[PDB]
């Protein structure tokens, strides 16, 4: 399950960058580090924890795309 | 034991390793001859103490000589580099356990090796001074003979006074062509002239408080030359304006590279002056202080001008003088690159977005059985992202560019050989109305990029203004500005990528200078340089058969240049520029051609870079935005190849070369190198002919494939892979590991990879041909992810896929079924995309068949 | 047409860039040369009244900008308006080794010649 | 422009990974975190 998680992380940053996350140097650097790690990842478990970290970063921000509706 | 030697006599010549404190040796005539010469040359403190005992006792020598250090650093091989280790640890340059580290030898990895080498700098500089003292005594005592590196120990003491012959006193003339020439590469690697930066050439005293307003240093340069290269028997022009030919320019620019490391870094770059326009005072460049070409003064300097014409304004806008004078002093601590100033009140940080994943294609591909967990075709190429401090991090890679001094006598021969490779093309100056411009939308550089692309300026200027501007550049220097940005790319690595936009002023004049030659090379088929030859319509097949010309025992080979665009020394780039300008023997004079050379050297070699929001100084390297960088790379590529063959053919013992013609080729190659300062047009032909027969090159910018006679390469008559590693170490300051180098023994399977493409012999029409195919991951990677300009219109998506299908068609012939299935997937997807929206129809395989059949070369 | 507009833009840029350099400092530098010719690198070094320092981490700040004044380019400089990579204002009391993980490095330290 | 997030969440559902769906369900009713998960919560 390599391709699915990598594409998911790519689109996850695609979403994050649209939430104006560029404005935070530390957070954006961390997100880019996680994304590049996922893309360079060769093992599924590593991709999983990095993906959940990135998703938690995305989902912590309130006022973003509604999640209750989905 | 094996010790390096530099030998040239009536039977063998070269610089290789042969077999042979208080050193001793063992004839009556020689013993009497040497003793008399020694007595006449004893009171000089630059020679080692000698004793008369049938043996010539030689007292208090070092374990290794200067030749070993020169040879070891010039033929570096991390597999067998012991002799280098002993010298470094012996002389307290580092610790023995320092070699437990990984990549200790590497320059890019562990750049602290530079400090270790620099610990030999003072030791080497002391050797230089002793040589002048030694040569002084020989001159006074009337002695003639050749000074050889092997006869000087690492402490500077000379010995072995046997080759010399007596003559009338006060008229001695020593020959130092071989000594200095072979030693130059180590002078900058060890920073020999570091001590010259202190008050009295003492490494225990403060740095000289150079006057900030000084720029000339011509007298300082002459004094430096006179102290170290006193008997270097060729006039040295501190300012290369005075040279008589490009062979002098290379000669004198090489020295200026070494001498510019002692002067303050603030004394270089454009020299400004206060001029008045209609009474208002500007600050403009009325000269330039190159680290290589010395001081150059513009000849058309005008003051109190009533008004500024369009041509005049372009020169002033491009000049960084006004930009650097109006900005704030900048102290950037992220980089070690000298910073001139900041042009804005705040530093700007720029980031690289992620890739725009295309779900539609991905869901289609998986349904067709792709991406099954465990297949040989997967995803390995992605649009990587970058954080804010990436551009400056990318720019800081220029720290790999170091001042490199070249083996001038060797470079002056390689240039003649490299010149023959370009002797089948026509070129020269052309007017503003004969220039053809492709891709007018290229950025015009800073500040011109504020108001449009190169299309705007080319439209505004009349043919006369362009002509005068070109004529202006033939008598002055225009130091323009280049702007570096970040670019989106698909790659298997997260390294950032940048594209440089050179100033429009520099591109306009360069095209009028090189366009005629560039077109000639691009329109030629069958030559060593293959640029502008399409792989389609059998081109790949014809290209390969040209490489395969007549090589007797062919194997293929390939290599790479680590950090090529960043680590290329300035001497080799200047050399490449001179080779290209050799066609102007009728459209330009000596003075005219020098002011042309100075313009590229100030525009695309050591110009000022507007990175981020501030202004820095580029130490060297190539500019991706220049049009001639690809062709200049080819000259650099061939020069490195010819240098490898010269080092290969001179570092191999001539006694063990069973052939007779080759041994004669070796002996005469040495003569034309370190003797015979005239260009021996005859011998240059034989070597060029010899290379073409046994070392056939298909060269495109910084990438090459070589069909080389294996037997000769095996026994050292032709460059091998190790030879390229050796050359890059001491002429590029980079370690080139074999992990990225490939060699192939069977020609049926074409080159392993050339310009990022693979080869496979396939059957078409009862005939076997070569087809170029890419790595399927790239083809799939470029389909899944797109740069976000295609979403506006589906047509752009179609053209993207067809272009990928064209390059994917050869996979159909691959033995692997997964690979062949890739092209069908793209064709089926194209059908779907075309459906939603005889051989000219891109939705049938016949369209993609014609692209690789020579019978129809129609475009 | 386009030539006219680009000419106007270039003239405007050159004249605006002149209204912020001419001074007694530059004139003094120019008249101290052999023939009023000087390296371009030393003009902003010895004439600029504004200094920008981009600080990557905290060790560099210790080692360059401790206290409220520092010496660089053979001159005394006085610090004002330190700023982070997020472009927010930073107070001199916030620059400490224990607080260093919280700050958005690199830091832009601006200084006036004094 | 919200389609990107809808496609994101469709992909997340398609993955059907335990941790990701766990966190998505947790945030379903509004229980969301504030900081990056190390390699604190509300309610
Ligand atoms: O940037 C490029 N490719 C993308 C991917 C891509 C882009 C467009 C496309 O549909 C398909 C894939 C990437 O690797 O990130 C690219 C693509 C192409 C290309 C596009 C369609 C058909 C054939 C070639 C391309 O031609 N190029 C690029 S980067 C690039 C850099 C130098 C270059 O030199 C040529 C210029 C013209 C002749 C003289 C030398 C070309 C060049
Ligand atoms: O260097 C390349 N790619 C870089 C990225 C890159 C580099 C430079 C650049 O600005 C843009 C992107 C990477 O993979 O890391 C590259 C990629 C591709 C490629 C991309 C997608 C799909 C298939 C092939 C590619 O096709 N190429 C490269 S370098 C490269 C050099 C020459 C070239 O043309 C051939 C044509 C036939 C005669 C010999 C010259 C093609 C070529
Ligand atoms: O690196 C490249 N060019 C260099 C050197 C060069 C190469 C060939 C040439 O005569 C002239 C100059 C340059 O001028 O900067 C290069 C060139 C070409 C090219 C070569 C011949 C004819 C047309 C295009 C080129 O096509 N490319 C490059 S770097 C490069 C990167 C990506 C890329 O994607 C394509 C690959 C094929 C499928 C669709 C996406 C293409 C690509």
Residue numbers in the entry:
A (entry chain C): 2 to 71
B (entry chain A): 31 to 50, 69 to 74, 76 to 102, 112 to 895, 911 to 932
C (entry chain B): 78 to 191
D (entry chain D): 84 to 122, 129 to 132
Publication excerpt:
The RdRp is essential for replication and transcription of the viral genome and is therefore a highly promising drug target. Using RNA elongation and fluorescence polarization assays, we show that HeE1-2Tyr is a competitive inhibitor of RNA binding to SARS-CoV-2 RdRp and thereby prevents RNA extension.
We acquired cryo-EM datasets of RdRp without RNA, but in presence of 50 µM HeE1-2Tyr, as well as RdRp with 0.5% DMSO as a solvent control. This resulted in ~200,000 RdRp particles containing an extra density, which could be refined to 3.0 Å. The stack of three HeE1-2Tyr molecules binds directly into the RNA binding site of nsp12 between the finger, palm, and thumb domain. The stacking between the three HeE1-2Tyr molecules is driven by the aromatic pyridobenzothiazole moieties of the compound molecules, which are arranged on top of each other with a planar antiparallel geometry. The carboxylate of HeE1-2Tyr1 and the guanidinium group of Arg836 are 3.3 Å apart, which suggests the formation of an ionic bond. Such a cation–π interaction is formed between the hydroxyphenyl moiety of HeE1-2Tyr1 and the guanidinium group of Arg555. Indeed, when the RdRp–RNA and RdRp-HeE1-2Tyr structures are superimposed, a steric clash between the stack of HeE1-2Tyr molecules and the RNA becomes apparent.
